Structure formats: C-alpha cells, structure tokens
Amino acid sequence: NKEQTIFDHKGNVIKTEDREIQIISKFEEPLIVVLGNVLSDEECDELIELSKSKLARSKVGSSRDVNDIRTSSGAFLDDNELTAKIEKRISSIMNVPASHGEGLHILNYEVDQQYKAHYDYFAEHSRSAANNRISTLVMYLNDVEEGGETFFPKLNLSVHPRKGMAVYFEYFYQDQSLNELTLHGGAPVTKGEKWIATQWVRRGTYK
C-alpha cells in the first residue's frame, strides 16, 4: 500500500481556472511529475524580466520582510497581479493554497554554472523545519541549448529544460527514505543559459 501524495490529479490534464496543464510523465515513489503548458511564452519572458534589479540599490523582492526566506542566489519576485495569477495556477497544480508558497523565486544560470545536488527541505533539527517545505515546482522559463538538466542522482533520472514546462516533486512522506530520494541538482549549462522559476511550498500558511 503506497503512501498518500499531496499531488493527486488522476488524469492526463490538470484543469486550472485559467489554463489546462498537461501531465506528461511521472515517477511514483517519491512522486516526480513532468508537466506541460504550465506557463505561456509571454509569462516566462515577463518572469525573467521582473527578476532584474538592473544595478539599482534595492534588491528585487525588497518588499519581503525578515520573516521571509532570503535567497542569496536568484531573486524572490515582489508580489503583483502576474505573480498572484501564476501562484494561483501553481496552487491548483500542487494542490496546496498559494498562501503556503514562498513566492516565485527566479534563478539564472550562465554557461558552465550549475546547482550541486541538494534537498529542498530544511535540516531535520533545524529551526526552519518547524514549517518545513513539503514540495517543489521548478518551471523552465527558456530553452537551454545544451545541459541544464534537473537531475535526481539517487534515482538515475533527469528532466531536461523546455520552455513552459515544469517538474514537480514532493517530499512529505513518512518513510524518510522516500524524501531522501528527492535529492536533486541542476546540471551545468554547457551551451546557452537557463532561467527557472521555483515555487517552494510549506506545510503551513507562510504568506
């Protein structure tokens, strides 16, 4: 008897209020789902541009408080109608209220940059682990000429960037060994560049 998952959409599409998302493939335990048609091309481009501080003194996401998680690398977007619209769609996908999301986090990889394998949930006895992360949505905002795979090294599987698509995965299982298998990284970009939006989702209301 498999454990319950947060994501429980049973078909080949997720009908959200403003967009029909395609369920492409999935690995079952832990649950890793490739999703098509998550963002339009225009939404992808706008999220990239919104992430830019453009050498000004104020960092994008400056409207976030000392209770907010702060990202050294990349930027959390400031809330607006677009991010709210997208967070609502993502909430239908991830089956959790948008109030549990940390907000759209944008990251750029230049050529040869990578993200070493890591967990998205916080350390077990950490303080952040009181309202720990339970699931991730990584959205590909552009096409990557070569490289840039999201790889899960303990599962020997990867998802390749494709503009408008996403990879979803969760790690709220009671057998910790399942959460351990969501170890993942971003492979080096070897030609071109890579842009992603990540939604990290908390067990409890976050914002």
Added chain:
Amino acid sequence: KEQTIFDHKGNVIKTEDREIQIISKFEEPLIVVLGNVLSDEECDELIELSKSKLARSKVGSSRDVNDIRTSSGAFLDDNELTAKIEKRISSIMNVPASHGEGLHILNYEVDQQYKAHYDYFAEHSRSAANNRISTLVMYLNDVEEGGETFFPKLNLSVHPRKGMAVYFEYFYQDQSLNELTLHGGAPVTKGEKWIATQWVRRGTYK
C-alpha cells in the same frame, strides 16, 4: 554503466526534417520521453490511414490488446508519409530504418488496455535470433483519461500527449536490466487512444 544504443546527449535531437525535444530520461534501463516527434498533421494522417487499414484488413478483433497474437493488419502499408516518418525515427533510435518492423497502429477505446509485457522475444524462440532491441511508442492523439504507458517494475509512467513519444531499449548484457522494461498500456477510462509503434530489431529486417 553499459553503453546504450540511444546516443543523444543534449536537449534536442536534430533530424533531417525535425528537431525532437528530449524531455526526460530514466537512465537504466534507458527510457526517454520525447517531444515534437510527429506534427499534428502527421498524427492526424496516420490515424486516417489506420482507419482505412483496420477497415480494409477487417481487423479489430479481441476485447483488449494482446501480445500472444500477430497483428499484420495493423501495420500501415508503406507510402511516402510512412517512409519519411521511419527515416526520422531511425535518427531518434540510432538504428537504421531497415531494422524496423514498420509503423504498427493500435487503438484503445474506453476500458481497453494492453497488459504488461516485454517487447523482446524469449531466448531460444525463433525470433530471438533477430530479436527486438528497442521500442518507440508515439501518441497520435490526446486521451481524456487513462492510457498511460506504464513500467510496473520501475514505478514510472508516461501519459499520452499528441505528438510526443516514449523511447526505451532492452539490449543490455545484464538481463535484469532488460526485464525492468516490462510495460503496458493502462486502461483508457475516458475518450480513446491511438498510438503508432516502431519495434527495432538487432539485425536487418527488410
């Protein structure tokens, strides 16, 4: 790790007439989800060809699909379209089109399925002298619900999406790797499922 037939290491496969998208990979045994394999028009035309073929061959017999029997009536007749598609496929699969059996068409209506099976033949069968080594399953339409291609020993499934495909191979020296490619077509629960399949042999098959 054993070398795979499928050689493509980037995010796209550039064929003569089409740029295929590599969407995701399970490494061992190798299972690859491919985008943009067939245009919408190619999918639509393959289905119309199948309807003619299934009708003219008076095919469509059993309740569910079944790997015991032959299925000659469900291979499309060779024409310009099919040759063009097999040429593309051969660049994807990295095996000459002369090793392919040809575009085999299957249709599933509600509650029909294809129970888990290996595509390759058992050792010492007569077909094992020139055994199948890899499969490409192309989704020719969208399926309201159900109809996933599933691999039960790997807990992995590919959902039908018009124009996409799932590639997998089973030519490993480690027989346990080949046995992990056990796979089936899950019941359609809403709508209907059309696929084309290319099975590729170790040696020439033309």
